[PDB]
Amino acid sequence: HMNSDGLTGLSNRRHFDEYLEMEWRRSLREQSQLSLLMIDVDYFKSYNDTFGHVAGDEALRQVAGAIREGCSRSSDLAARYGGEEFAMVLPGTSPGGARLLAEKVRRTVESLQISHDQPRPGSHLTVSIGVSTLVPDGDGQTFRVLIEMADQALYQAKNNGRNQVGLM
Protein backbone atom coordinates (compact mmCIF):
# COMPACT_ATOMS: atom_id res chain seq x y z
CA HIS A 1 0.00 0.00 0.00
CA MET A 2 0.91 3.70 0.13
CA ASN A 3 2.09 3.22 3.70
CA SER A 4 5.08 5.60 4.12
CA ASP A 5 5.61 8.96 5.69
CA GLY A 6 6.39 11.46 2.92
CA LEU A 7 9.07 13.53 4.68
CA THR A 8 11.10 10.67 6.08
CA GLY A 9 10.38 7.78 3.69
CA LEU A 10 9.84 5.41 6.62
CA SER A 11 6.73 3.42 7.41
CA ASN A 12 3.87 5.46 8.84
CA ARG A 13 2.42 4.80 12.26
CA ARG A 14 -0.63 2.90 11.01
CA HIS A 15 1.54 0.48 9.04
CA PHE A 16 3.94 0.15 12.02
CA ASP A 17 1.07 -0.77 14.31
CA GLU A 18 -0.32 -3.34 11.85
CA TYR A 19 3.10 -4.87 11.19
CA LEU A 20 4.08 -5.06 14.87
CA GLU A 21 0.78 -6.77 15.64
CA MET A 22 1.35 -9.30 12.81
CA GLU A 23 4.89 -10.02 14.03
CA TRP A 24 3.62 -10.32 17.57
CA ARG A 25 1.02 -12.92 16.45
CA ARG A 26 3.75 -14.89 14.61
CA SER A 27 6.22 -14.63 17.51
CA LEU A 28 3.51 -15.74 20.01
CA ARG A 29 2.78 -18.86 17.90
CA GLU A 30 6.52 -19.61 17.48
CA GLN A 31 7.62 -18.50 21.00
CA SER A 32 10.35 -16.45 19.28
CA GLN A 33 11.99 -13.25 20.43
CA LEU A 34 10.84 -9.88 19.05
CA SER A 35 12.90 -6.72 19.63
CA LEU A 36 11.76 -3.10 19.37
CA LEU A 37 13.56 0.26 19.32
CA MET A 38 11.78 3.46 20.27
CA ILE A 39 13.77 6.52 19.15
CA ASP A 40 13.20 10.15 20.00
CA VAL A 41 15.15 13.15 18.74
CA ASP A 42 16.85 15.05 21.55
CA TYR A 43 16.09 18.74 22.07
CA PHE A 44 14.09 18.85 18.85
CA LYS A 45 11.69 21.59 19.94
CA SER A 46 14.60 23.94 20.60
CA TYR A 47 16.18 22.94 17.25
CA ASN A 48 13.02 23.67 15.30
CA ASP A 49 12.38 26.89 17.25
CA THR A 50 15.94 28.20 16.73
CA PHE A 51 16.57 27.12 13.12
CA GLY A 52 13.00 27.08 11.70
CA HIS A 53 10.73 24.36 10.40
CA VAL A 54 12.49 23.85 7.02
CA ALA A 55 15.77 23.08 8.82
CA GLY A 56 13.87 21.03 11.45
CA ASP A 57 12.13 18.93 8.79
CA GLU A 58 15.39 18.39 6.88
CA ALA A 59 17.06 17.30 10.13
CA LEU A 60 14.22 14.77 10.67
CA ARG A 61 14.76 13.52 7.12
CA GLN A 62 18.49 12.97 7.74
CA VAL A 63 17.80 11.27 11.07
CA ALA A 64 15.31 9.01 9.32
CA GLY A 65 17.99 8.06 6.80
CA ALA A 66 20.31 7.09 9.63
CA ILE A 67 17.52 4.95 11.15
CA ARG A 68 16.71 3.26 7.79
CA GLU A 69 20.39 2.09 7.61
CA GLY A 70 19.64 0.08 10.75
CA CYS A 71 17.33 -2.20 8.76
CA SER A 72 19.00 -5.09 6.92
CA ARG A 73 16.91 -8.29 7.33
CA SER A 74 13.75 -8.64 5.25
CA SER A 75 11.53 -8.59 8.37
CA ASP A 76 13.04 -5.41 9.87
CA LEU A 77 10.82 -2.34 9.73
CA ALA A 78 11.54 1.30 10.52
CA ALA A 79 8.73 3.82 11.04
CA ARG A 80 7.93 7.40 11.88
CA TYR A 81 5.88 6.83 15.01
CA GLY A 82 5.11 10.52 15.69
CA GLY A 83 6.46 14.04 15.18
CA GLU A 84 10.04 13.36 16.34
CA GLU A 85 9.55 9.73 17.41
CA PHE A 86 10.67 6.73 15.35
CA ALA A 87 10.39 3.00 15.89
CA MET A 88 12.05 -0.11 14.59
CA VAL A 89 10.67 -3.67 14.72
CA LEU A 90 13.39 -6.37 14.73
CA PRO A 91 11.92 -9.87 14.45
CA GLY A 92 14.22 -12.63 15.65
CA THR A 93 16.80 -10.18 17.05
CA SER A 94 18.29 -11.08 20.40
CA PRO A 95 18.97 -8.34 23.02
CA GLY A 96 22.73 -7.86 22.40
CA GLY A 97 22.05 -7.58 18.66
CA ALA A 98 19.25 -5.06 19.34
CA ARG A 99 21.48 -3.03 21.68
CA LEU A 100 24.32 -2.86 19.18
CA LEU A 101 21.88 -1.90 16.40
CA ALA A 102 20.58 0.87 18.66
CA GLU A 103 24.14 2.09 19.27
CA LYS A 104 24.72 1.99 15.49
CA VAL A 105 21.64 4.14 14.87
CA ARG A 106 22.55 6.58 17.67
CA ARG A 107 26.15 6.98 16.54
CA THR A 108 25.10 7.30 12.91
CA VAL A 109 22.82 10.18 13.90
CA GLU A 110 25.58 11.90 15.86
CA SER A 111 27.94 11.42 12.88
CA LEU A 112 25.56 13.60 10.79
CA GLN A 113 27.18 16.46 12.83
CA ILE A 114 24.07 18.60 12.67
CA SER A 115 25.10 21.57 14.83
CA HIS A 116 22.93 22.44 17.84
CA ASP A 117 23.32 24.69 20.93
CA GLN A 118 21.54 22.26 23.26
CA PRO A 119 22.44 20.87 25.71
CA ARG A 120 25.37 23.30 25.35
CA PRO A 121 27.04 25.44 22.70
CA GLY A 122 28.93 23.32 20.18
CA SER A 123 26.71 20.23 20.41
CA HIS A 124 25.24 17.99 17.69
CA LEU A 125 21.69 16.70 17.09
CA THR A 126 21.29 13.35 18.83
CA VAL A 127 18.72 10.67 19.58
CA SER A 128 17.80 8.73 22.67
CA ILE A 129 16.75 5.12 22.15
CA GLY A 130 14.94 2.55 24.25
CA VAL A 131 15.25 -1.14 23.49
CA SER A 132 12.93 -4.00 24.44
CA THR A 133 12.89 -7.71 23.66
CA LEU A 134 10.18 -10.24 24.49
CA VAL A 135 8.98 -13.70 23.72
CA PRO A 136 5.24 -12.84 23.51
CA ASP A 137 2.61 -13.89 26.07
CA GLY A 138 -1.16 -13.22 26.17
CA ASP A 139 -2.88 -12.57 22.79
CA GLY A 140 -2.47 -10.42 19.66
CA GLN A 141 -3.31 -7.18 21.57
CA THR A 142 -0.60 -7.80 24.20
CA PHE A 143 1.92 -6.31 21.64
CA ARG A 144 1.53 -2.93 23.38
CA VAL A 145 3.61 -4.37 26.27
CA LEU A 146 6.66 -4.38 23.99
CA ILE A 147 6.07 -0.68 23.20
CA GLU A 148 5.66 0.14 26.88
CA MET A 149 8.91 -1.63 27.75
CA ALA A 150 10.82 0.22 25.01
CA ASP A 151 9.23 3.50 26.11
CA GLN A 152 10.38 2.84 29.65
CA ALA A 153 13.94 2.28 28.44
CA LEU A 154 13.65 5.48 26.35
CA TYR A 155 12.37 7.44 29.39
CA GLN A 156 15.44 6.18 31.27
CA ALA A 157 17.76 7.26 28.43
CA LYS A 158 16.25 10.76 28.30
CA ASN A 159 16.42 11.30 32.05
CA ASN A 160 19.98 9.95 32.29
CA GLY A 161 21.30 12.65 29.93
CA ARG A 162 20.08 11.89 26.40
CA ASN A 163 22.23 10.75 23.45
CA GLN A 164 22.21 7.19 24.78
CA VAL A 165 20.59 3.80 24.60
CA GLY A 166 18.43 2.52 27.45
CA LEU A 167 17.76 -1.18 27.93
CA MET A 168 15.09 -3.51 29.32
Automatic annotation (TrEMBL):
UniProt binding sites for Mg(2+) 2: 85
Subcellular location: Cell inner membrane
Domain of life of the native organism: Bacteria
Residues reported to bind 3',3'-c-di-GMP 1: 25, 29, 73-74
Name of the molecule in the record: diguanylate cyclase
Record domain GGDEF: where: 32-168
Annotated binding of 3',3'-c-di-GMP 3, by residue: 73-74
Amino-acid positions noted as binding 3',3'-c-di-GMP 2 in the UniProt annotation, renumbered to this chain: 29, 72-73, 76, 93
Gene behind this protein: wspR
